[PDB]
Amino acid sequence: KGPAEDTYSTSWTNVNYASDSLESHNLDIYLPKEQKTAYKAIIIIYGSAWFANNAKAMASASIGAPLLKAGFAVISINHRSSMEAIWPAQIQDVKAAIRYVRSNAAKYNIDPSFIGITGFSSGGHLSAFAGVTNGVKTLTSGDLTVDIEGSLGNYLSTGSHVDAVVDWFGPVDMAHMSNCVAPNDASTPEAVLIGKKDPREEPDWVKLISPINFVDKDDPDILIIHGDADNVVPHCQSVNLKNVYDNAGAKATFISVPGGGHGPGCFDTQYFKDMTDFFTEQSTK
Ligand SMILES: *S(=O)(=O)c1ccc(CCN)cc1
């Protein structure tokens, strides 16, 4: 459970970041084995089609070790299930976790001058969504307004911005999920996220769950990694995100994994190195 014991010198597990009693608002913190005065931080988020509220250990086991070996503190967070709270609960959870880490950095030997964020599938969606809403309190489409920043926890005065994003095959363009050209029907995970409505009938909801719509020239840099044989979230999603970053004047690096699946082929030394090199380069810029 979690990252290999020899990858970290210090661990805090099941730290609640929302000042409540919900496991969906817990996180785990790991500091690298290589001891140092303070550590730049990476927040990681599991994928689960937004359904899981307790899988932070899976994320740590999946991509925690390379980050620790690269010298970063790793914070793996839970978020609430789409089945217990609809959008924007999940991004409000992420924002609250970010505020908790930034505010409490000193207590955990964390250097708050760099906080990156990364996740796979729905965790990549949440990571990208944080990276397109630095400094953004609310978003509106038509008559619908969602509170992105939220009011969860006891660190509301702390900033919730992230400095860099790594998006592992995240669903980010739900207007173009079905056959890469249309919204999915009410049977699908994004339908649950928006309250079990039919995405094909809810253009405002679909816009407000899709971070591709809010990319701006001033966004933090992003690294996008997607397998060209992903049979769960289509490659077109990351192609589209890169095109939007390119056309918005923002900075995106897109790495396509040949033969890569929804994880398989992607979680290997080469692309872990791409992620840790990216975060390391960003940590200095
Ligand atoms: S990812 O594994 O978290 C993921 C998988 C499947 C979906 C459904 C999109 N129609 C979303 C995210």
Author numbering: 8 to 292
From the publication, what sentences describe this entry?
BD-FAE, a previously unknown protein encoded in a metagenomic PUL from beaver droppings belongs to the functionally diverse α/β-hydrolase superfamily. We demonstrated that BD-FAE removes feruloyl and acetyl groups from simple model substrates, acetyl groups from birchwood glucuronoxylan, and feruloyl groups from highly substituted AcFaXOS from corn fiber. The His-tag was not visible and the N-terminal tail showed weaker electron density than other residues of the protein, most likely due to its flexible protruding nature. Overall, the BD-FAE crystal structure adopted a typical α/β-hydrolase fold, which was consistent with the above mentioned BLASTp results. The active center contained the conserved catalytic triad of Ser128, Asp237 and His269 and the oxyanion hole was composed of NH-groups of Gly53 and Ser128.
The final model of the truncated form was refined to 1.85 Å resolution and contained residues from Met8 to Lys292. Surprisingly, also in the crystal of the truncated form, higher-order oligomers were observed indicating that N-terminal deletion was not sufficient for disrupting this assembly. Surprisingly, the crystal structure of an N-terminal truncated form of BD-FAE (∆Met1-Pro7) adopted a similar spiral shaped polymer. The interaction surface area of sequential molecules in the truncated form, however, was determined to be 764 Å2, which is 28% smaller compared to BD-FAE (1055 Å2). In the crystal structure of the truncated form, the serine protease inhibitor AEBSF (4-(2-aminoethyl)benzenesulfonyl fluoride) of the lysis buffer covalently bound to the active site’s Ser128. The phenolic ring in bound AEBS moiety resembled the binding of ferulic acid and tetrahedral sulfonyl of Ser-AEBS mimicked the enzyme–substrate–intermediate during carboxylic acid binding at Ser128. Based on that observed complex structure, Araf substituted with a 5-O linked feruloyl residue (Fa-Araf), a common substituent of xylans, was successfully docked into the active site of BD-FAE. The amino acid residues that bound Fa-Araf in BD-FAE were similar to those binding the AEBS moiety, and were in a long α-helical loop after the β5 strand. A stabilizing disulfide bond between Cys186 and Cys242 prevented extensive movement of that loop. The hydroxyl group of ferulic acid bound in BD-FAE to Glu197 in a bidentate way.
